[PDB]
Amino acid sequence: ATRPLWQPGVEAPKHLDGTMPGDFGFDPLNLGVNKEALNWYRNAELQNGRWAMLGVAGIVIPAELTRVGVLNVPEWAEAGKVYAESENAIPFASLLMVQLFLFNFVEIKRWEDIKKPGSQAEPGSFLGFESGFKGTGISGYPGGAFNPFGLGNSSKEAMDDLKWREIRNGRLAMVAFLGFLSQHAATGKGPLDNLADHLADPWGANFCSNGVSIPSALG
Amino acid sequence: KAGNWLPGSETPAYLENLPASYGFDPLGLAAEPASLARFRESEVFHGRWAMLGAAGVLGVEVLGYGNWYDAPLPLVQGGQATYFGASVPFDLGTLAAIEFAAMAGAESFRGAAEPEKRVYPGGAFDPMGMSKGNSKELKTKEIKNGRLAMLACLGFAAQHAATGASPLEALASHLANPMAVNFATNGVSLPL
Amino acid sequence: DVAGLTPCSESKAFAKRKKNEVKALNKRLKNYEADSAPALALKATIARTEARFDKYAKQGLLCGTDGLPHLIADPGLALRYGHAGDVFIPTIGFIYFAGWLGYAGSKYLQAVAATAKPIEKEIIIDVPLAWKLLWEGFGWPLRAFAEYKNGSLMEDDAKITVSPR
Amino acid sequence: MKDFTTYLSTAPVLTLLSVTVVAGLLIEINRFFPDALIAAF
Amino acid sequence: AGWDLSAEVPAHLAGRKDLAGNYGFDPLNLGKNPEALKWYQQAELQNGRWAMLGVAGILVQELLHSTGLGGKAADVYWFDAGNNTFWAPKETLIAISFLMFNWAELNRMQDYIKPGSNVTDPFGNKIKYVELGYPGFDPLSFSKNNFDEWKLKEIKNARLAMLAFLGIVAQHNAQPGSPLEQLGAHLANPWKNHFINNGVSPFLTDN
Ligand code: CLA
Ligand code: CLA
Ligand SMILES: CC1=C[C@H](O)CC(C)(C)[C@H]1/C=C/C(C)=C/C=C/C(C)=C/C=C/C=C(C)/C=C/C=C(C)/C=C/C1=C(C)C[C@H](O)CC1(C)C
Ligand SMILES: CC1=C[C@H](O)CC(C)(C)[C@H]1/C=C/C(C)=C/C=C/C(C)=C/C=C/C=C(C)/C=C/C=C(C)/C=C/C1=C(C)C[C@H](O)CC1(C)C
Ligand SMILES: CC1=C[C@H](O)CC(C)(C)[C@H]1/C=C/C(C)=C/C=C/C(C)=C/C=C/C=C(C)/C=C/C=C(C)/C=C/C1=C(C)C[C@H](O)CC1(C)C
Numbered sequence: 001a002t003r004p005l006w007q008p009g010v011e012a013p014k015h016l017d018g019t020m021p022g023d024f025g026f027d028p029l030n031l032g033v034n035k036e037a038l039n040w041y042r043n044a045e046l047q048n049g050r051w052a053m054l055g056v057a058g059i060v061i062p063a064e065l066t067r068v069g070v071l072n073v074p075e076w077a078e079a080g081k082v083y084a085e086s087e088n089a090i091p092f093a094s095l096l097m098v099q100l101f102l103f104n105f106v107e108i109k110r111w112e113d114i115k116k117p118g119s120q121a122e123p124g125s126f127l128g129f130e131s132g133f134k135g136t137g138i139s140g141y142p143g144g145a146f147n148p149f150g151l152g153n154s155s156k157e158a159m160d161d162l163k164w165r166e167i168r169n170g171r172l173a174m175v176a177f178l179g180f181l182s183q184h185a186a187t188g189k190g191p192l193d194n195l196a197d198h199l200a201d202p203w204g205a206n207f208c209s210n211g212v213s214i215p216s217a218l219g
Numbered sequence: 220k221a222g223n224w225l226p227g228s229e230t231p232a233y234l235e236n237l238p239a240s241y242g243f244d245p246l247g248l249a250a251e252p253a254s255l256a257r258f259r260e261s262e263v264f265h266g267r268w269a270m271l272g273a274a275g276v277l278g279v280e281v282l283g284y285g286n287w288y289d290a291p292l293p294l295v296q297g298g299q300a301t302y303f304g305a306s307v308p309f310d311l312g313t314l315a316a317i318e319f320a321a322m323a324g325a326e327s328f329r330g331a332a333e334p335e336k337r338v339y340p341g342g343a344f345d346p347m348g349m350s351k352g353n354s355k356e357l358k359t360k361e362i363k364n365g366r367l368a369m370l371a372c373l374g375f376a377a378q379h380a381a382t383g384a385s386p387l388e389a390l391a392s393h394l395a396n397p398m399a400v401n402f403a404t405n406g407v408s409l410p411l
Numbered sequence: 412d413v414a415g416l417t418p419c420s421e422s423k424a425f426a427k428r429k430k431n432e433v434k435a436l437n438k439r440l441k442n443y444e445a446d447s448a449p450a451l452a453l454k455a456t457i458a459r460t461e462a463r464f465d466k467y468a469k470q471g472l473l474c475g476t477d478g479l480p481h482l483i484a485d486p487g488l489a490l491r492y493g494h495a496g497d498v499f500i501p502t503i504g505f506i507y508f509a510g511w512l513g514y515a516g517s518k519y520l521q522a523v524a525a526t527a528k529p530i531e532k533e534i535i536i537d538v539p540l541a542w543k544l545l546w547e548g549f550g551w552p553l554r555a556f557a558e559y560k561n562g563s564l565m566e567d568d569a570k571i572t573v574s575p576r
Numbered sequence: 577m578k579d580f581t582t583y584l585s586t587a588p589v590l591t592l593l594s595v596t597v598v599a600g601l602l603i604e605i606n607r608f609f610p611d612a613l614i615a616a617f
Numbered sequence: 618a619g620w621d622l623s624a625e626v627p628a629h630l631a632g633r634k635d636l637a638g639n640y641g642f643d644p645l646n647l648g649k650n651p652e653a654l655k656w657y658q659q660a661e662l663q664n665g666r667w668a669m670l671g672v673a674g675i676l677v678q679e680l681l682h683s684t685g686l687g688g689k690a691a692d693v694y695w696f697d698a699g700n701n702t703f704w705a706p707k708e709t710l711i712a713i714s715f716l717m718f719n720w721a722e723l724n725r726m727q728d729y730i731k732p733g734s735n736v737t738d739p740f741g742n743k744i745k746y747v748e749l750g751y752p753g754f755d756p757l758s759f760s761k762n763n764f765d766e767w768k769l770k771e772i773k774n775a776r777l778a779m780l781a782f783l784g785i786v787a788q789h790n791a792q793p794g795s796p797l798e799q800l801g802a803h804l805a806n807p808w809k810n811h812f813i814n815n816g817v818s819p820f821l822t823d824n
């Protein structure tokens with residue numbers, strides 16, 4: 001209860017005890033007052049953070065490599081159109097449907113794990129692979145086939161440290177992807193281009209000069 | 220056991236009396252006894268078919284009859300397949316139908332037996348009767364040769380996905396110029 | 412062209428209506444001196460009218476037989492033809508904002524219902540509590556769906572008064 | 577000022593101030609963003 | 618306390634005397650967690666040893682470049698070392714480097730997760746093992762006497778060489794030429810030639 005909070009002076013809400021990774025007591029809208037809704041929101045936070053970490057990596061590492069003359073990857077916002085003009089390009093609707101079908105199969109299993117944490121581990125499910133879906137008792141942290149290197153499964157507090165690192169990195173990358181979307185919506189340049197322009201003149205190059213954030217009607 | 224996969228490690232308890240066991244299961248896929256029981260037969264079956272496939276590709280390339288990739292290429296384009304110069308007037312539909320019927324019959328009449336009988340049978344499959352008289356090290360040899368054959372077959376697939384040449388042609392080119400003709404030199408394996 | 416309607420960017424009657432409005436305002440202009448306050452007011456009105464007509468032509472609205480913008484209230488028919496801002500996007504906006512207000516009022520009712528005098532709290536509103544619940548009502552859809560899945564949003568019929576048929 | 581703020585918290589004062597601030601916000605929205613027929617983003 | 622007089626050792630650097638170069642320097646307290654401190658000690662040994670090897674290579678090759686011993690192989694700048702043809706191209710060199718360093722570093726990590734479990738080779742030969750990051754690779758035997766002092770000398774040289782390589786990359790990205798040439802150009806005046814008079818370091822001066 002004495003952990004650092006999102007406001008030194010504001011006590012944590014009674015539904016945020018401190019057990020969850022990354023619980024800084026931040027819930028001013030009280031969205032997680034229901035415990036089952038809180039568990040669903042924790043799983044949603046894990047999924048959004050992991051997908052944002054993957055997406056932000058796939059944005060900022062190829063863009064940086066293009067900046068230093070490696071691989072030469074186009075802008076992330078126009079990378080869909082760059083591939084869609086290829087001579088052997090899969091059509092957009094067909095590719096989306098294939099991705100959605102595979103993700104349907106995978107994430108309905110993940111959903112059933114969210115309900116009962118030991119769902120998919122029952123015998124006779126797969127073809128001998130059901131043993132890898134035992135889970136660790138907390139949904140969103142499967143283990144088994146996932147986590148091959150077995151990082152953190154040694155001292156329990158080692159896994160809690162890695163859980164906090166994961167949740168902070170996921171939140172940072174979610175904020176970063178929101179920044180990427182808003183930066184490209186306002187300025188037709190990449191995230192590294194926006195960063196380089198800001199270092200040229202921080203008082204001149206920012207969100208108050210794109211003309212899209214602050215509306216021109218007010219000023 | 221003979222081996223431990225890593226030189227120094229904790230060993231899974233369910234991988235000791237198994238032939239050709241090195242304790243290699245970091246994912247823990249065979250923690251359940253039924254999972255191990257099915258996966259053992261799966262590994263034996265995969266190794267046997269991989270040995271058959273590796274023998275097929277090596278014998279189709281070194282005997283000078285063609286490439287393994289180009290085997291079903293003349294199956295369309297009009298028709299007429301090739302096997303030792305035989306005309307074989309079978310089209311694509313009848314060939315697939317006969318193969319499906321044969322495989323369905325063989326596999327249905329196969330995997331309806333006992334767990335030991337599904338993977339390790341006798342009768343007409345060992346006519347010379349040398350399964351008797353120390354079968355553990357022979358099983359170990361079978362599993363190890365099967366693993367080597369699976370590695371060879373997946374290497375053939377990945378190599379033809381990469382450079383796109385023949386297996387023995389790529390081997391000859393690698394022996395001729397080991398500097399610029401490796402897996403690393405083409406722009407598909409090492410991007411940096 | 413979604414239902415026999417032409418875009419107002421190319422429909423002639425839209426330009427005719429804009430010209431008629433600007434000409435009427437110019438007829439109003441032609442009575443004062445150039446720099447008078449009525450002249451500035453009429454110039455501002457003209458600028459607003461031209462900006463409105465140019466914006467309506469820019470946004471891609473549909474005009475009918477004459478130059479009046481028409482809105483499409485069918486999803487799909489407005490999504491694939493690019494007129495979701497006519498009805499669909501304001502539908503989502505109203506649903507969100509009305510749910511915010513209604514959920515804030517609901518949570519105020521259930522918060523003051525379990526007090527000493529719920530009668531007094533509805534004419535004498537606890538302003539900090541109302542402000543807090545108005546802020547919390549911005550996450551109304553997720554909260555409402557969670558309470559619906561929990562079953563705490565609706566009341567059992569056996570605890571609700573009815574008439575004796 | 578407890579009684580004065582309680583009077584300010586009474587239903588008519590609060591509803592008149594609330595409709596006043598809402599109407600003023602909408603009016604200034606139409607002042608800076610006039611003739612918004614559709615939600616064109 | 619050793620790194621800073623009138624300062625107190627950060628608790629977890631006090632009771633553990635068996636650390637090479639334990640001078641109490643941890644103001645940000647990175648290794649309060651004992652497992653984190655073990656990881657950071659292994660990272661110390663690895664970074665220090667690779668930096669000693671790297672800085673010795675830079676200094677020796679630049680000495681041979683400035684004086685002149687080797688042929689066209691040694692007559693190139695260290696940052697331009699890839700211009701030579703050598704014996705193998707880039708891709709296969711990087712590939713075999715990946716393979717054999719995977720082998721060696723996985724042996725090292727297998728030692729890390731269980732000390733002494735990986736000292737035996739399939740040939741049957743066995744070696745002695747001591748401590749954790751000190752696997753007893755001592756053929757001519759200088760470890761039998763005052764091993765703490767030798768470890769302290771090693772860790773001091775390792776820290777000096779990590780600082781050296783940080784200096785090498787910073788100088789190279791700041792001023793042109795070889796690091797020995799940069800040292801000589803410093804020694805020229807030396808009141809003017811230093812890191813302030815670069816136009817790339819202070820930024821407050823020369824825009
Ligand atoms: C926030 C309070 C509140 C809430 C949550 C509801 C909710 C509901 N009302 Mg109701 N209503 C209210 C206040 C409220 N009403 C008031 C004050 C009146 C008197 C004018 C009415 C008169 C009324 C009638 C006659 C009917 C409903 C009906 C309904 C239901 C249909 C949906 C609807 O919006 O209808 C429309 C709602 C209105 C027209 C009234 C809205 C008045 C304002 C906007 C709400 C009050 C705001 C409140 C002061 C905010 C407090 C904030 C808090 C932080 C302090 C729905 C569940 C209908 C129904 O029974 O459906 C089956 C119906 O027939 N309402
Ligand atoms: C100036 C840009 C640049 C950069 C950034 C690199 C980077 C790298 N080179 Mg390369 N190289 C360059 C230019 C560059 N090179 C040039 C100009 C040439 C000659 C033309 C070469 C020729 C060359 C060869 C021949 C080889 C390399 C290799 C390597 C890798 C070292 C192996 C390793 O790190 O272990 C492995 C890494 C890990 C186990 C973990 C990944 C790294 C993470 C991020 C942790 C590392 C921390 C990080 C370094 C510290 C932060 C940055 C710090 C500088 C502030 C490395 C990633 C070697 C290689 O490919 O690997 C064997 C290799 O053999 N380079
Ligand atoms: C806490 C709380 C509670 C209280 O009570 C209240 C409040 C305040 C409300 C709160 C807050 C919240 C928030 C902040 C939220 C946010 C979120 C996000 C941002 C997410 C994202 C998230 C995000 C995500 C997933 C993302 C992902 C991404 C991706 C995949 C990407 C992809 C890609 C790439 C690679 C590149 C290419 O070329 C393109 C693409 C294809 C595009
Ligand atoms: C154990 C484990 C456990 C832990 O825990 C984890 C992990 C790591 C995951 C693991 C591992 C795994 C792996 C490695 C796997 C792999 C496999 C393989 C490779 C297979 C192949 C496999 C392979 C195979 C079958 C192959 C086969 C082949 C064939 C048939 C061929 C055929 C043919 C021929 C003759 C020739 C002609 O002209 C063509 C054709 C007709 C085509
Ligand atoms: C303690 C602490 C704690 C507290 O609390 C906080 C703080 C303050 C943060 C801290 C501190 C820290 C630091 C200072 C760190 C640093 C490190 C380093 C510098 C490393 C390096 C490290 C470094 C390294 C490894 C390096 C290495 C190098 C090398 C290999 C090189 C190589 C080479 C050669 C030979 C030659 C050729 O031609 C080129 C090349 C290829 C280039």
Ligand SMILES: NCC(=O)NCC(=O)O
Binds near residue numbers: 257260330331
């Ligand atoms: N009862 C047959 C059976 O269990 N088959 C499993 C397999 O396909 O290996």
